[PDB]
């Protein structure tokens, strides 16, 4: 299907506790493959997936340089932004940067995005044309103007349309044995009485990759039961995902409920019952 190469960068000021903490993580689809963290002596970009272990010094040297340079620029950005918003040196503040390229099923560029947040809210966004920006307020308007001065959209357009796509293809080849492997969920139902009158039915999906899944309970073979208890899809810790959904039902009425699981790894949707 579609594939994506994305990074998530965070810089947090730590007033009187050292310089800002900076962390970068890169993903292909739902798989982390690199990280950089400056909370350490001589910090380097390092592999975080087995298939990246083979990369040589050319790669690690260039990616460490980029991450170190970004950390420095983010450090300066944090000071500037305090300036724009008339904030003292006393509080801690956050700058986030996310970006990515997305290939469609036909294996070519479909979309690229880039966005900045300050203190957990949108600040500056690259527009869909990848040639202009949207600023949330008068402070971000200055950053917009600096970007226009510096032809920053051109730099980011070249990364998103060209470099990001070239490397996404490389990574998909390097890691194909796992990245292109659909792992379907192992599913089961649990059943626990709550009272004389009611019981919990819980539908589990375990061990699946990628993360995208739909888990629903249906009553009487149409629709979805209201007030289904869902949990956010969570990592197993081994590169696969887990999710469950639960309903509370009247005792003796369990046969009216079906759990429905859709996942790219399943030949067809799975239906479970108690």
């Amino acid at each position: 299907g579609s594939h994506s190469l994305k990074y998530f960068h965070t810089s947090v000021s730590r007033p009187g506790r050292g310089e800002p903490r900076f962390i970068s993580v890169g993903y292909v689809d739902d798989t982390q493959f690199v990280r950089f963290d400056n909370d350490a002596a001589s910090p380097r970009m390092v592999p975080r997936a087995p298939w990246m272990e083979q990369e040589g010094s050319e790669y690690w040297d260039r990616e460490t340089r980029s991450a170190r340079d970004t950390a420095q620029i983010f450090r300066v950005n944090l000071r500037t932004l305090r300036g724009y918003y008339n904030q003292s040196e006393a509080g801690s503040h956050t700058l986030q940067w996310m970006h990515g390229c997305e290939l469609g099923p036909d294996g070519r560029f479909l979309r690229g995005y880039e966005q900045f947040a300050y203190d957990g809210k949108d600040y500056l966004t690259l527009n869909e044309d990848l040639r202009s920006w949207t600023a949330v307020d008068t402070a971000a308007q200055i950053s917009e103007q600096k970007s226009n001065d510096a032809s920053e959209a051109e730099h980011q357009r070249a990364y998103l349309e060209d470099t990001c796509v070239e490397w996404l293809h490389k990574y998909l080849e390097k890691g194909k044995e796992t990245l292109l492997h659909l792992e379907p969920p192992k599913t089961h139902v649990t059943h626990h009485p709550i009272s004389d009158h009611e019981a919990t039915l819980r539908c589990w999906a375990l061990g699946f990759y990628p993360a995208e899944i739909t888990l629903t309970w249906q009553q009487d073979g149409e629709g979805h039961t209201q007030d289904t208890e869902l949990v956010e899809t969570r990592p197993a810790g081994d590169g696969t995902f887990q999710k469950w959904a639960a309903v509370v039902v009247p005792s003796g009425e369990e046969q009216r409920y079906t759990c429905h699981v859709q996942h790219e790894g399943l030949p067809e949707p799975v239906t479970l019952r108690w």
């Binding site: 980029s66 620029i73 300066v76 500037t80 932004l81 970007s147 920053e152 470099t163």
Partner: peptide, 9 residues
């Protein structure tokens, strides 16, 4: 790989 340019705000 990550971008070779990091925007100045």
């Amino acid at each position: 790989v990550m971008p070779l340019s990091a925007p100045t705000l």
